[PDB]
Design an enzyme around this catalytic site. Structure first.
Site, PDB file in Angstrom:
ATOM      1  CG  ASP B 259      36.618  26.023  18.500  1.00 37.55           C
ATOM      2  OD1 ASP B 259      36.201  24.979  19.055  1.00 37.55           O
ATOM      3  OD2 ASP B 259      36.464  26.251  17.276  1.00 37.55           O
ATOM      4  CD1 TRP B 356      36.272  13.206   7.653  1.00 38.16           C
ATOM      5  CD2 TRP B 356      35.911  15.222   6.729  1.00 38.16           C
ATOM      6  NE1 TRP B 356      35.067  13.156   6.966  1.00 38.16           N
ATOM      7  CE2 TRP B 356      34.834  14.376   6.386  1.00 38.16           C
ATOM      8  CE3 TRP B 356      35.905  16.556   6.262  1.00 38.16           C
ATOM      9  CZ2 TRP B 356      33.759  14.810   5.591  1.00 38.16           C
ATOM     10  CZ3 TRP B 356      34.823  16.998   5.478  1.00 38.16           C
ATOM     11  CH2 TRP B 356      33.773  16.124   5.149  1.00 38.16           C
ATOM     12  CG  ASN B 390      38.154  15.728  16.079  1.00 40.58           C
ATOM     13  OD1 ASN B 390      38.855  15.272  16.959  1.00 40.58           O
ATOM     14  ND2 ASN B 390      37.211  16.646  16.328  1.00 40.58           N
TER      15      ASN B 390
HETATM   16  O1  LIG Z   1      37.234  21.938  14.382  1.00 37.67           O
HETATM   17  C1  LIG Z   1      38.119  22.468  15.071  1.00 37.67           C
HETATM   18  C2  LIG Z   1      39.409  22.991  14.402  1.00 37.67           C
HETATM   19  C3  LIG Z   1      39.373  22.527  12.950  1.00 37.67           C
HETATM   20  S1  LIG Z   1      40.863  22.937  12.006  1.00 37.67           S
HETATM   21  N1  LIG Z   1      38.039  22.679  16.381  1.00 37.67           N
HETATM   22  C4  LIG Z   1      36.914  22.228  17.233  1.00 37.67           C
HETATM   23  C5  LIG Z   1      35.516  22.711  16.752  1.00 37.67           C
HETATM   24  N2  LIG Z   1      34.994  23.934  16.636  1.00 37.67           N
HETATM   25  C6  LIG Z   1      33.724  23.831  16.227  1.00 37.67           C
HETATM   26  C7  LIG Z   1      32.756  24.999  15.920  1.00 37.67           C
HETATM   27  C8  LIG Z   1      32.796  26.085  16.995  1.00 37.67           C
HETATM   28  C9  LIG Z   1      31.962  25.635  18.194  1.00 37.67           C
HETATM   29  C10 LIG Z   1      32.591  24.995  19.271  1.00 37.67           C
HETATM   30  C11 LIG Z   1      31.835  24.589  20.364  1.00 37.67           C
HETATM   31  C12 LIG Z   1      30.454  24.818  20.371  1.00 37.67           C
HETATM   32  C13 LIG Z   1      29.822  25.444  19.304  1.00 37.67           C
HETATM   33  C14 LIG Z   1      30.581  25.847  18.214  1.00 37.67           C
HETATM   34  C15 LIG Z   1      33.436  22.529  16.062  1.00 37.67           C
HETATM   35  N3  LIG Z   1      34.505  21.805  16.384  1.00 37.67           N
HETATM   36  C16 LIG Z   1      34.758  20.340  16.419  1.00 37.67           C
HETATM   37  C17 LIG Z   1      33.430  19.549  16.386  1.00 37.67           C
HETATM   38  O2  LIG Z   1      32.717  19.868  17.568  1.00 37.67           O
HETATM   39  C18 LIG Z   1      35.625  20.066  17.661  1.00 37.67           C
HETATM   40  O3  LIG Z   1      35.798  18.672  17.887  1.00 37.67           O
HETATM   41  C19 LIG Z   1      36.991  20.704  17.463  1.00 37.67           C
HETATM   42  O4  LIG Z   1      37.731  20.495  18.657  1.00 37.67           O
END
Ligand SMILES: O=C(CCS)N[C@H]1c2nc(CCc3ccccc3)cn2[C@H](CO)[C@@H](O)[C@@H]1O
Ligand SMILES: O=C(CCS)N[C@H]1c2nc(CCc3ccccc3)cn2[C@H](CO)[C@@H](O)[C@@H]1O
EC number: 3.2.1.169
Lengths: 585, 585
Positions: B259, B356, B390
């Protein structure tokens, strides 16, 4: 200099052989006395309307127009054609040749010549006509409309305008069958009051004037009795009813068995058979009987590749010369693939008739169905000989889709839904076509969320841009060019609808004003949804909340309001945007 | 005549060898001095809590309990086991035999003894124990939770309770990585205040007691510097931060790169490799390093079966020792098929770690995710050795999903998602389980309308019944019995939620009270939808209008609510029923 105008339907064979020419202030007319009367009157009508005078005696340097049939004695017709002719063509075929000073229209029959005149009318723009060779004929023998819906029936004046419109677009069949005309179904035994009898006479008269087969439909199935004296009394009501219309000039008839609880296949078929023997054959000049079975869609007719009991009995009882309608794989379906027509044709061992339930909206009245014929196999003619559409109670807006139906049934093999859709709005809307395109594009797909679904998807290009926005934003890639671009689209929707509200003729405007308002609302809510995303990206809390209440209030207006449009596109976008969390850190 | 109670996770090999027996009020404990300390403390706690005394002097009338490792020298263990050992099992495996007043727990190592004790605890119901032969071991060697969501982090009490729960269900991994802990990411450079350090010490200690690997995560990616003196200083900041946690007993560490906008694969990897060398290897007792790349799902990692530029560079640079996490084919995605793991695993040529994103709900906070692990290949262990989920910011309700994650990762091959989900609710909710099943069954599928979708469909069996109602009504068939059955389902939905409101412990009710009221609202709208249908069937126009207004208000209420539940079933049914036009007559 000079280009072929939009034509509908698309002629089978058209060749540009010259540069084109101007048609003079007044013209020579050859053949009026032996040609088809209806064809000639349509010519006269057009000629008066375009300030074109007919010569009393030939001049040598006026444009010459020759019109007749192949059987007719007109030597100048054989001359002006110079090679090509309508002798080799099926019923309703015609040849037309435009070559320096000479237009020649030759039909294989009276219908043919009438149709040639229609093409001629579409060819002439500005007194200019291109130089063309044309031979033309329909793919499908019977093409038209079944007024077969629930809700307020078309007004008498509506129908007169529809019948004219069918003529201009080479549609030959109009089926009178309004579920909500009491004398057609609820009180099917009872004769028409004198005043409706006279209005009916005008319709039959207008139908003949336009080479349209007026088909008189009756639906006795709710309470018809079959056995004994009551069966006798009821059968004689059918004959009586039919005779009173036959006496006014009706030569085509339908008895329908749809949407009833009674499933007496043998008895339905036997009513049809007796009417075929005692009325159709006995009259000698009446067209084949039309019907639909109580099972009329593949889902209802077939279980496990085998016909169900009703269909099996109906198929084996009903006489071979009777036309049987069915709606496809479902009552309101996405598609009629070839394999479905093959299946149903083989069950019935005859060429089938199609009752296509689009653009009809009786089942989902809030949405206008404004798209092309969509989902129909381009080889359907192999198993189908009779193609009709059930329209909307909104007669004027139904023309867009009917226009495409006219192209699909006449020239099936070359039918391009997207091109026929654009040509339909162009030909119908004039200086308003581009704006009407923007609106109508968001209103093609019909879906009641359960059993009924059909039509091209609403605004697919815009839908794909929306998906790409979410894709970019969720991948955390820069999206500002696409966002700028979606502002352009939403502002374009709103402008188009506003121009349409200000400039549509009343006849169209009365049918769509609410849906125009809906789309403006959704566009406004679409724009605010963009403001809302931009604010989250800018981490501006104030601007977010303020765009969010706007977007939610626009969505709330659209959902609470009767009109329905763009569910999966402009309306879904607001929902999608409200559900996208960009406040994550 | 016992029987075997619900067990989680499902043991690899379990066999009923007899009728079962009752364990005495007082027992003989053998091996307590020699066996694993944590297993014994877990055992003593269970005995104390279940009013079971320990004899200080042996008594042949008392039930005998024997505990230890294979490596321990204990003659009674070998005798009580009689043929079965943990000798040839993998790490964390154990043998358990309960037979004729004897219970023998032998672990392959100390971790397996602990898990043996855990299975013992689930086996005893009211001093009764089935007679069983068990050998057991995990499919996957690292199994647990990454607290890595956005939103309010779990409270300190939350975490302590989760860790105990992880122990009881044989989950061995807890990754501390909350996005909104400022010292994790926002101010990753800055040390934890001393009071927060004390809170950390208790987490570490509780983890050790429950055989859970507490993994300390850090996420420097937003603004870490890489070059010159600036990068040196920032690297020492990572070392300092990890050292301060190592000094308290942390022996696993994670450095995450998700992110962020900076896509410098070679630099990210260089940081990791430097940390692997100067920290992880330098220390000798630290478990392999954990990371995720900035490209961490297959859409972001791969183009046409090949790695993208960032991924290619990351994979070529990062040390073979390092555990690399990825989330599957998308960030929040339906499935991880075997072909996805094979692909990623090939690019990094190492077994992979899974992050996950279910039951996490940060991207759609209104819905609770209460479903089982769903979509994960049962053969995943061929390319994955590390599985974590997660969870939601809602600790307590996360347990249902986590419960099934314990079963999937420990016994992958035999994992049944419906069985596991049912078992999870039975084991967690006790007397409230049937009611919790009704409610949670409506809240399993996650869908933000755009990029994020995952989980079992909401109420599948109810969805199929609604489907069949529409299939009957649109075919004008008798649907009375089915209508009646639906009235019963809807009333039951309401009854369950009301019983849950009144009797749920606060710790669970605090997290779902809005979703409870929302399901009651939809259930009432669903009932009203049925009323509306029956009125339309009976031509009762006024009862229809009255029911319509209720169905519509109930839907509008649910749509307005922050709470979301059963979008595609309970909610959609109302929209379906409002669009189903049965007034056409
Ligand atoms: O999934 C990861 C690393 C995976 S190894 N990082 C986090 C993550 N990144 C995203 C997509 C990018 C995004 C982030 C905020 C708003 C829109 C898109 C989704 N997520 C998860 C679900 O929301 C969030 O809980 C995680 O903290
Ligand atoms: O389709 C046929 C005869 C096909 S040869 N009949 C009519 C018909 N029947 C159905 C499905 C059964 C049904 C009818 C009313 C209310 C609910 C279900 C749909 N439709 C059309 C679209 O609403 C309606 O306009 C037609 O009059």
């Amino acid at each position: 200099q000079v280009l072929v105008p939009n034509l509908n339907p698309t002629p089978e064979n058209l060749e540009v052989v010259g540069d084109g020419f101007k048609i003079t202030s007044s013209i020579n007319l050859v053949g009026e006395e032996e040609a088809d009367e209806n064809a000639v009157n349509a010519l006269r009508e057009f000629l008066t309307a375009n300030n074109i005078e007919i010569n009393s005696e030939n001049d040598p340097n006026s444009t010459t127009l020759i019109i007749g049939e192949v059987d007719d004695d007109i030597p100048e017709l054989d001359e002006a054609l110079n090679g090509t002719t309508a002798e080799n063509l099926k019923e309703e075929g015609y040849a037309l040749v435009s070559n320096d000073g000479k237009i020649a229209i030759e039909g294989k029959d009276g219908d043919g010549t009438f149709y040639g005149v229609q093409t001629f009318k579409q060819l002439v723009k500005e007194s200019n006509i291109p130089e063309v060779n044309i031979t033309d004929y329909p793919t499908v023998s019977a093409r038209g409309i079944v007024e077969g819906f629930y809700g307020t029936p078309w007004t008498h004046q509506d129908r007169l305008d529809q019948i004219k419109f069918y003529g201009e677009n080479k549609l030959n069949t109009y089926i009178y069958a309004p579920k909500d005309d009491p004398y057609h179904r609820e009180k099917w035994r009872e004769p028409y009051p004198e005043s409706e009898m006279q209005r009916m006479q005008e319709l039959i008269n207008a139908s003949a004037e336009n080479k349209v087969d007026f088909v008189f439909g009756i639906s006795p199935g709710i309470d018809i009795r079959f056995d004994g004296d009551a069966g006798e009394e009821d059968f004689n009501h059918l004959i009586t009813k039919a005779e009173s219309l036959y006496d006014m000039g009706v030569r085509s008839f339908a008895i329908y068995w749809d949407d009833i609880q009674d499933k007496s296949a043998a008895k339905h078929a036997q009513v049809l058979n007796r009417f075929n023997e005692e009325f159709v054959k006995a009259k000698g000049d009446v067209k084949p009987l039309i019907t639909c079975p109580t099972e009329y869609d593949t889902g209802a007719m077939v279980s496990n590749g085998q016909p169900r009991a009703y269909t099996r009995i109906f198929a084996e009882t009903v006489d071979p010369s009777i036309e049987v309608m069915w709606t496809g794989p479902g009552v309101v379906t996405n598609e009629i693939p070839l394999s479905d027509a093959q299946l149903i044709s083989g069950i019935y061992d005859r060429n089938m008739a199609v009752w296509w339930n689009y653009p009809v909206t009786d089942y989902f009245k809030g949405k206008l169905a404004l798209g092309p014929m969509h989902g129909l196999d381009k080889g359907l003619n192999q198993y189908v000989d009779f193609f009709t559409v059930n329209p909307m109670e909104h007669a004027e807006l139904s023309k867009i889709s009917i226009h495409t139906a006219a192209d699909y049934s006449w020239n099936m093999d070359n039918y391009d839904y997207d091109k026929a859709w654009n040509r339909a709005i162009d030909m119908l809307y004039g200086d308003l076509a581009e704006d009407m395109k923007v609106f109508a594009n968001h209103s093609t797909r019909m879906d009641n969320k359960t059993w009924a679904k059909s039509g091209r998807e609403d605004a697919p290009e815009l839908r794909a841009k929306m998906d790409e926005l979410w894709n970019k934003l969720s991948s955390k890639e820069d999206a500002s060019a696409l966002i700028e671009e979606l502002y352009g689209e939403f502002a374009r929707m709103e402008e188009a609808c506003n121009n349409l509200k200000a400039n549509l003729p009343e006849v169209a405007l009365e049918e769509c004003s609410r849906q125009l308002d809906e789309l403006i609302t959704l566009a406004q809510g679409d724009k605010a949804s963009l403001d809302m995303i931009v604010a989250q990206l800018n981490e501006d809390t104030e601007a977010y909340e303020s765009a969010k209440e706007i977007a939610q209030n626009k969505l709330n207006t659209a959902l609470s309001s009767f009109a329905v449009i763009s569910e999966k596109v402009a309306q879904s976008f607001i929902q999608e945007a409200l559900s996208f969390d960009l406040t994550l850190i």
